[PDB]
UniProtKB/Swiss-Prot annotation:
Job description of the protein: Involved in the biosynthesis of mycolic acids. Forms, with FadD32, the initiation module of the mycolic condensation system. Synthesizes, in coupled reaction with FadD32, the biosynthetic precursors of mycolic acids, alpha-alkyl beta-ketoacids, via the condensation of two long chain fatty acid derivatives, a very long meromycoloyl-AMP and a shorter 2-carboxyacyl-CoA. The acyl chain of the acyl-AMP produced by FadD32 is specifically transferred onto the N-terminal ACP domain of Pks13, and then transferred onto the KS domain.
This protein's name: Polyketide synthase Pks13
Gene (UniProt): pks13
Region (Acyltransferase): 119-439
The organism's place on the tree of life at top rank: Bacteria
Portion of the parent chain present: 595 to 1063 of 1733
Species name: Mycobacterium tuberculosis (strain ATCC 25618 / H37Rv)
PTM remark: 4'-phosphopantetheine is transferred from CoA to specific serines of apo-Pks13 by PptT.
Note in the entry: Identified as a drug target. Fatty acyl-AMP loading is inhibited by thiophene (TP) compounds, which kill Mycobacterium tuberculosis. Overexpression of wild-type Pks13 results in TP resistance, and overexpression of the F79S mutant confers high resistance. Structure-guided methods identified a highly potent and very safe lead compound, TAM16, a benzofuran class inhibitor that targets the thioesterase activity. The thioesterase-like domain is inhibited by coumestan derivatives that possess excellent anti-tuberculosis activity against both the drug-susceptible and drug-resistant Mtb strains.
Domain notes: Made of a minimal module holding ketosynthase (KS), acyltransferase (AT), and C-terminal acyl carrier protein (C-ACP) domains, and additional N-terminal ACP (N-ACP) and C-terminal thioesterase-like domains.
Length: 468
């Protein structure tokens, strides 16, 4: 079984993307400067001493990258900080805040490690944008390798290339391609994180469920790819054949689950697609009923947003698809998860590492057909000690929902770590992500954020690489 390679057209598009890339104003890269100590008091002094030095002409003459590399080789203590800086001025200002115990947008500082490992959040719909993943694909060999990996599997399964979609600026995403391309971006972002030493304590999903199965060791990459391919082409083909009274809209309204139970007595065909947050629910059903609940919400001063789809996932309109989905997913091999799963399919309940497999065919049918218990899964994570939530996405849509649920459960302090975002540099974003994992004491080998020194100019004249 030999997989499709990268397509001619993908190679052509890459050649063009690389030329366009080579001819742009080069930006200062974002460099992470880590400082740590057993005591916060010492960390703060270390930050101040580093600043003083970076102000000196010898400091000024050393590159941020050589300083960060040197800093990366120190003992990483329990009290930690990172200044994300593009130049010496930014680094110093940030180091000053660290020392002063003050805060600033490019600075993370904490007295000790968070107690529990991070929850990886794999959402999806709403996160897509035309150029998503393109810049990181061109600029990161590891990310690129994983995108190409998923690209082969998706070619093999559906007969087109997601890499073509990523590189081609004229192409935009639909119900089908959004799913498989975000999947690809999710897989590649996570493997990139794993490459730098990170891992999930648990996963939660809102597709994102396919990727979450992969990263939880519930399915092989192949089987996760089948899960997303099968689901996505069926939904895209179904939604395109929908016109008139067949249409079913989806919309976001500021009603709690309890509110919805009362409100729905007036709207007999509405269903819940997603419990997104304590007072935010995605509802679905016939257009006249969706507009009426929207109107009722707007009149009560509650937020309400109609989505763009002629179809309603997680409603009864999915019934015709379940047959095909069943047939198509026959053969998949559900495995025992290797990290925890908050399953938004199974009402937000938790499956332990080593537990029984969950990711059988019936799970994907159940998932497509029934409500997504997102806020419930998040609430269950908070209540079991989790404070770090890290969203693998092209745009951080789900973190805004996560914050509502964490706040509502009495966690005012949560560590909400995004990955990529539109109109934010993708390499910078990932530096920031990995910086933050480091500062909170999660697994992250900060040494791997710099290339191996080839000479002494790759170090700065500070401990532990002082020039004898
Ligand atoms: Cl040290
Ligand atoms: Cl260390
Ligand atoms: Cl320590
Ligand atoms: Cl902080
Ligand atoms: Cl690279
Ligand atoms: Cl519970
Ligand atoms: Cl708190
Ligand atoms: Cl945060
Ligand atoms: Cl290297």
């Amino acid at each position: 079984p030999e997989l499709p390679g990268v397509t001619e057209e993908a190679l052509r598009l890459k050649e063009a993307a690389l030329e366009e890339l080579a001819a742009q104003e080069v930006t200062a890269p974002l460099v992470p400067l880590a400082v740590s100590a057993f005591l916060t008091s010492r960390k703060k002094a270390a930050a101040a001493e580093l600043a003083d030095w970076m102000q000196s002409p010898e400091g000024q003459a050393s590159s941020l990258e050589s300083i960060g590399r040197s800093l990366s080789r120190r003992n990483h203590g329990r009290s930690r900080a990172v200044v994300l800086a593009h130049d010496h001025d930014e680094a110093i200002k940030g180091l000053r805040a660290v020392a002063a115990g003050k805060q600033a947008p490019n600075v993370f500082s904490v007295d000790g490690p968070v107690t529990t490992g991070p929850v990886w959040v794999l959402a999806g719909f709403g996160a897509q944008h035309r150029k998503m993943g393109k810049s990181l694909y061109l600029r990161n060999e590891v990310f690129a390798a994983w995108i190409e990996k998923v690209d082969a599997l998706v070619q093999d399964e559906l007969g087109y290339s997601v890499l073509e979609l990523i590189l081609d600026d004229a192409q935009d995403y639909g119900i089908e391609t959004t799913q498989v391309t975000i999947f690809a971006i999710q897989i590649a972002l996570g493997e990139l994180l794993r490459h730098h030493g990170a891992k999930p304590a648990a996963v939660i999903g809102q597709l994102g469920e396919a990727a979450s199965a992969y990263f939880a060791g519930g399915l092989s990459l192949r089987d996760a790819t089948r899960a997303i391919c099968s689901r996505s082409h069926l939904m895209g083909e179904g939604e395109a054949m929908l016109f008139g009274e067949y249409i079913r809209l989806m919309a976001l309204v500021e009603y709690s689950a309890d509110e919805i139970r009362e409100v729905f007595s007036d709207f007999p065909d509405l269903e819940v697609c997603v419990y997104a947050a304590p007072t935010q629910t995605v509802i679905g059903g016939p257009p006249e009923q969706v507009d009426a609940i929207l109107a009722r919400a707007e009149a009560e001063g509650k937020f309400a947003r109609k989505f763009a789809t002629k179809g309603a996932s997680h409603t009864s309109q999915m019934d015709p698809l379940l047959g095909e989905l069943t047939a198509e997913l026959q053969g998949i091999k559900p495995t025992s998860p290797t990290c925890g799963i908050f399953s938004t399919v199974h009402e937000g309940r938790y499956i332990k590492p080593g537990g029984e497999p969950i990711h059988d065919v019936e799970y994907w049918k159940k998932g497509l057909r029934h409500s997504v218990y997102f806020t419930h899964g998040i609430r269950n994570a908070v209540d079991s000690g989790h404070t770090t939530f890290l969203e693998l996405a092209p745009n951080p849509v789900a973190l805004m929902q996560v914050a509502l649920t964490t706040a509502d459960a009495g966690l005012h302090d949560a560590q909400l770590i995004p990955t990529l975002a539109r109109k934010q540099d993708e390499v910078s974003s990932m530096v920031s992500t990995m910086a933050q994992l480091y500062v909170y004491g999660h697994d992250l080998d900060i040494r791997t954020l710099f290339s191996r020194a080839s000479g002494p100019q790759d170090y700065a004249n500070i401990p532990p690489t002082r020039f004898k």
